[PDB]
Amino acid sequence: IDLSALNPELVQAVQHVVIGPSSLIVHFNEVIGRGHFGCVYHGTLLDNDGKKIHCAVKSLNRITDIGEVSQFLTEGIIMKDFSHPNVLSLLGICLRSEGSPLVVLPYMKHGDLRNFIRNETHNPTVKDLIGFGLQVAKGMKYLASKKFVHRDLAARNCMLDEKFTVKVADFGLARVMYDKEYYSVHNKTGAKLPVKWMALESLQTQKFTTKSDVWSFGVLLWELMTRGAPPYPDVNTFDITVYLLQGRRLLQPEYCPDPLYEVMLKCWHPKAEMRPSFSELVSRISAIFSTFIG
Numbered sequence: 338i339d340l341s342a343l344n345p346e347l348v349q350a351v352q353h354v355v356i357g358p359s360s361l362i363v364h365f366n367e368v369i370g371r372g373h374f375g376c377v378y379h380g381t382l383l384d385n386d387g388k389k390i391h392c393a394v395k396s397l398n399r400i401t402d403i404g405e406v407s408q409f410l411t412e413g414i415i416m417k418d419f420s421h422p423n424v425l426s427l428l429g430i431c432l433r434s435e436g437s438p439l440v441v442l443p444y445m446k447h448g449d450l451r452n453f454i455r456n457e458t459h460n461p462t463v464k465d466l467i468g469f470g471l472q473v474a475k476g477m478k479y480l481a482s483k484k485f486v487h488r489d490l491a492a493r494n495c496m497l498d499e500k501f502t503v504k505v506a507d508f509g510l511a512r513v514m515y516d517k518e519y520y521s522v523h524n525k526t527g528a529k530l531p532v533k534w535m536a537l538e539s540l541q542t543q544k545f546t547t548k549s550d551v552w553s554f555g556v557l558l559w560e561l562m563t564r565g566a567p568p569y570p571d572v573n574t575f576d577i578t579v580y581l582l583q584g585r586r587l588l589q590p591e592y593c594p595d596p597l598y599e600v601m602l603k604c605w606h607p608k609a610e611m612r613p614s615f616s617e618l619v620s621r622i623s624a625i626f627s628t629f630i631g
């Protein structure tokens with residue numbers, strides 16, 4: 338990657354996001370995870386006093402050309418501003434002269450939320466599951482306040498830290514600014530569209546908004562209440578649009594309380610403008626959660 342060809346204003350603006358070998362040790366032989374985007378390694382970040390911070394280092398192996406690198410730096414500036422207890426922070430990025438760009442994130446002791454709830458050795462209560470959903474709603478309320486449209490909200494993209502605090506995050510492809518580019522990149526790399534989490538209007542028009550993130554949030558609540566069941570497992574991705582157009586939705590999970598399933602149905606309202614906001618979802622889910630004992 339030719340770092341000398343970048344826009345000098347953009348280089349100045351992104352400097353506060355860049356971290357390098359003076360503080361970060363990437364443990365390339367200790368792999369946390371492997372995805373279609375690249376790999377996630379254990380990393381160590383040292384502060385000025387020599388104190389060690391455990392981190393996850395996501396390698397975005399597909400970012401190579403100047404336009405992709407510039408868009409990566411712009412996304413790092415946007416996400417470096419994130420500060421919320423239910424949003425995974427960006428510690429920094431690495432733009433090396435040799436190797437792919439790196440995203441440095443706080444290490445998440447308990448991994449992704451979908452894996453946690455699906456594991457038969459774990460026993461989260463119905464109250465714990467609603468609590469996870471409420472944490473996701475708070476993180477999404479913060480992101481929505483920044484006009485940040487997630488597009489890929491699903492239980493597998495929320496992480497659990499050492500205290501079981503849920504952090505909204507993104508372990509998918511490199512984030513793009515424009516919806517047209519999001520579709521173009523998925524087609525070019527083979528990366529899967531998250532069809533079964535997408536709002537009806539996103540499937541038909543190829544556009545995403547905070548109102549389509551509310552639809553994905555409803556699917557995420559359903560994943561929580563089923564302990565990670567795959568949504569519409571029996572509906573082919575190419576038949577999902579007709580299924581939604583018939584007025585059909587994900588069925589009420591056995592352990593999902595009625596008021597919470599009513600919240601899910603409101604998230605999947607066919608008219609995007611009629612869906613609740615993330616602020617209304619936080620208020621409503623807090624009220625439901627307040628009636629669970631434990």
Ligand SMILES: C[C@@H](c1ccccc1)n1cc(-c2cccc3cn[nH]c23)c(=O)[nH]c1=O
Pocket residue numbers: 395409412413416419424425426427430440442487505506507508510511512513
């Ligand atoms: C901060 C966090 C996040 C993302 C979304 C919502 C809440 C939190 N985060 C950020 C990146 C990321 C950082 C910098 C540049 C790029 C470019 N693509 N992704 C970037 C990532 O890979 N994973 C991830 O979890």
